[PDB]
Structure formats: C-alpha cells, structure tokens
Amino acid sequence: VNSFSGYLKLTDNVYIKNADIVEEAKKVKPTVVVNAANVYLKHGGGVAGALNKATNNAMQVESDDYIATNGPLKVGGSCVLSGHNLAKHCLHVVGPNVNKGEDIQLLKSAYENFNQHEVLLAPLLSAGIFGADPIHSLRVCVDTVRTNVYLAVFDKNLYDKLVSSFL
Numbered sequence: 001v002n003s004f005s006g007y008l009k010l011t012d013n014v015y016i017k018n019a020d021i022v023e024e025a026k027k028v029k030p031t032v033v034v035n036a037a038n039v040y041l042k043h044g045g046g047v048a049g050a051l052n053k054a055t056n057n058a059m060q061v062e063s064d065d066y067i068a069t070n071g072p073l074k075v076g077g078s079c080v081l082s083g084h085n086l087a088k089h090c091l092h093v094v095g096p097n098v099n100k101g102e103d104i105q106l107l108k109s110a111y112e113n114f115n116q117h118e119v120l121l122a123p124l125l126s127a128g129i130f131g132a133d134p135i136h137s138l139r140v141c142v143d144t145v146r147t148n149v150y151l152a153v154f155d156k157n158l159y160d161k162l163v164s165s166f167l
Contacts, residue, residue: 002119002148003028004017004028004030004121004150006019007150008163010138010142010166011142013145013146013147013148013149014141014142014145014149014151015148015149015150015151016138016150016151016153016159016162016163017150017151017152017153017159018153018154018155018156018159018160019152019153019154020050020152020154021033021047021050021051021121021122021123021152021154022050022051022054022086024121024150024152025051025054025083025086025087025121026054026085026086028121029086029087029088030083030087030088030119030120030121030150031087031088031089031117031118031119031120032083032087032088032089032090032091032117032119032120032121033051033083033086033087033089033090033091033120033121033122034090034091034092034093034114034120034121034122034123034125035047035048035051035059035090035091035092035093036048036093036095036123036125036126036127036128036130037073037078037092037093037094038094038097039072039073039074039075039077039094040067040072041060041063041064041066041067041073041079041092042060042063043059043060043063045129046128046129046130047123047128051086051090054085054086055084055085055086058082058084058085059081059082059084059090062081062082062084063081063092066079066081073092073094074094075094075095075096075097075102075103075106075110076094076095076096076106076107076109076110077093077094077109077110077113078091078092078093078094078110078113079091079092080092087121091113091114091117091120093110093111093113093114093125094110095107095110095125095126095130095132095137096110096126096130096132097126097130097131098126098130098131098132099129099130099131104126104132104136107125107126107132107136107137107140108140108143108144110125110126111125111140111141111144111145112144114141114144114145114147114149115144115145115146115147117147118147118148119147119148119149119150120147120148120149120150121150121152122149122150122151122152123151123152123153123154124137124138124141124151124153125137125140125141128154134153134158134162135161135162135165138151138162138166139167
C-alpha cells in the first residue's frame with residue numbers, strides 16, 4: 001500500500017492522474033520524483049522549470065555543481081540528485097527533444113531508467129515542450145517500465161485523451 005490517491009489504474013504497474021506534478025510531489029513526498037531534464041540540467045521551463053521553481057532554485061544550484069563535476073548527461077540517460085522539498089530523490093531523466101531533432105527511439109532508453117526504482121512519481125517523458133506525441137510516450141512507458149509508476153498529467157484535456165485512447 002502507498003499514499004498515491006485518485007489515480008486511474010492503466011496496467012498492473014502504471015497509474016495515471018490529472019495533476020500538477022509539483023503539487024503532487026509536495027503532498028505525497030515520494031521516494032522518487034522524475035524530472036523531465038535536458039543534458040545540461042538547465043531547468044528553464046516545462047516540468048523542469050516548475051520543479052526547480054518549487055525548490056527556490058536549489059535544484060538548479062545542485063545541478064550546476066553536478067554538471068561542473070561530471071559533464072552533461074546522455075540523451076536517454078539519467079542521474080539521481082536530491083529531491084529537495086519535493087521528494088527524497090529526484091531522478092533527472094533526459095528524453096529526446098523532438099524540437100532539437102533527437103531520435104525518438106531513445107524514448108525507450110529514457111524510460112528504462114525508471115526500472116532502477118521500485119516506485120516513482122513521473123511526467124510523460126518527451127511530452128510537452130520536448131515535442132513528442134504524449135500518446136506514444138504513454139505507450140512506451142507501459143511497454144518499458146516494470147516498476148510502479150504514478151504518472152501526473154498537467155493538462156486535463158490531454159489526460160482525458162490519454163485515458164480514452166489507451167489500449
């Protein structure tokens with residue numbers, strides 16, 4: 001049993017809710033919140049900008065030190081950093097950004113990072129300002145992630161479309 005509330009069950013292990021991931025993280029304080037990161041961990045907009053703003057920029061400060069030490073992530077890769085006031089840990093995962101021309105096949109590699117964590121609160125990777133089709137992202141999630149994932153979808157209109165079209 002866990003504290004996630006109001007989710008629709010899509011499969012054995014994938015759950016979905018119309019929610020602001022920031023507000024959901026603040027309320028649940030999950031072990032892991034996933035950030036929709038880029039390779040530079042520059043949290044300017046989208047989910048990343050919102051999560052970072054909610055940490056009062058502490059996520060960005062920590063991220064800048066990480067990059068200075070380790071260099072950029074790979075597209076499809078991830079790193080574990082602090083969850084600050086939102087979660088125990090933040091798993092920064094880099095999905096391909098279609099608006100930069102990155103290969104969408106890398107979306108499966110990106111979701112494979114979730115399998116290293118038993119339970120996660122997450123957005124749909126490569127959705128929103130990353131330019132991919134969220135219906136496709138949900139399909140890859142369901143077909144790749146085997147651990148327990150609670151997906152937060154900000155847009156109510158999109159949430160209803162994802163549910164109604166789910167196979």
